[PDB]
Structure 1
Amino acid sequence: EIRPTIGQQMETGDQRFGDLVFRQLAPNVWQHTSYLDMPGFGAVASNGLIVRDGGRVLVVDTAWTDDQTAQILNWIKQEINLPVALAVVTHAHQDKMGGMDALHAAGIATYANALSNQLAPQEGMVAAQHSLTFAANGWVEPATAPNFGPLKVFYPGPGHTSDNITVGIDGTDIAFGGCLIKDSKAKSLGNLGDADTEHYAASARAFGAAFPKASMIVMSHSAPDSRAAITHTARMADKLR
Structure 2
Amino acid sequence: DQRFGDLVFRQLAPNVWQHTSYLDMPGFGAVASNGLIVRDGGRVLVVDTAWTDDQTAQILNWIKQEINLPVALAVVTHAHQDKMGGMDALHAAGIATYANALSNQLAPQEGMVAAQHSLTFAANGWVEPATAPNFGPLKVFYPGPGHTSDNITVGIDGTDIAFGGCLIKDSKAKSLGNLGDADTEHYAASARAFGAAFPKASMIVMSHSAPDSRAAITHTARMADKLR
TM-score by structure 1 length? 0.94
Residue 186 (structure 1) shift: 0.5
Deviations 1:65-100 (A, max 9, x none): 000000000000000000000000000000000000
Task: Render the CA deviation track for 1:126-182: whole Å, top value 9, x for unaligned.
Answer: 000000000001000000000000000000000000000000000000000000001
- Deviation for aligned residue 1:39: 3.6
Identity %: 100
CA distance in structure 2 between the partners assigned to 1:157 and 1:37 by the alignment = 29
Using the TM superposition, give the Cα deviation of residue 48 of structure 1 relative to its aligned residue in structure 2, in angstroms.
Answer: 0.1
What SS does the corresponding residue of 2:18 show, helix, strand or coil?
Answer: strand
1:185-227 CA distances to partner (integer Å, 9 max, x unpaired)? 1011111100000000000000000000100000001100000
Q: 1:144 to 1:77 in 2, by over 3 A?
A: same
Q: CA RMSD in A?
A: 0.7
2:134 maps to 1:140: no
Distance 1:206 1:40, change over 3 A: closer
Confirm whether residue 81 of structure 1 aligns to residue 39 of structure 2. Answer: no
Find the residue that maps to 1:184 and give its secondary structure. Answer: coil
2:37 is equivalent to residue 50 of structure 1: yes
1:165 aligns with 2:152: yes
SS in 2 for 1:70: helix
What secondary structure does 1:179 align onto? helix
CA distance in 2, matches of 1:38, 1:151: 31
| Structure 1 residue 124, shift from structure 2 partner | 1.3
Structure 2: where are the runs of 5+ without partners?
Answer: none
CA gap 1:134/1:40 in 2 versus in 1, 3 angstroms: closer
What per-residue deviation string (whole Å, max 9, x for no partner) do you get for residues 37-57 of structure 1?
Answer: 234542110000000000000
Task: Indicate the residue corresponding to 1:127 in structure 2.
Answer: 114
Residue-by-residue CA offset, 1:95-115 (whole Å, 9 max, x unaligned): 000000000000000000000
Distance 1:115 1:218 in 2: 23
In 1, Cα distance between equivalents of 2:144 and 2:24: 30
1:201, 1:139 → 2: CA distance? 18
Find the aligned partners of 1:41 and 1:189 in 2 and give their Cα distance: 14
Shift in alpha-carbon separation, 1:31–1:130, aligned structure 2, 3 A: same
Runs of 4+ in 1 over 4 A off after TM superposition: none
After superposition, the Cα gap between the structure-2 partners of 1:161 and 1:135, relative to the gap in structure 1 and judged at 3 Å, is same
Distance 1:66 1:27, change over 3 A: same
Write the distance in 2 (CA, Å) between the matches of 1:191 and 1:174.
23
Q: In the aligned structure 1, how far is the partner of 2:58 from the partner of 2:40?
A: 21
1:116 shift after superposition: 0.2
Measure, in 2, the Cα distance between the counterparts of 1:221 and 1:201: 18
Q: Which residue of 1 aligns with 2:182?
A: 195
Secondary structure of 2:190's match? helix
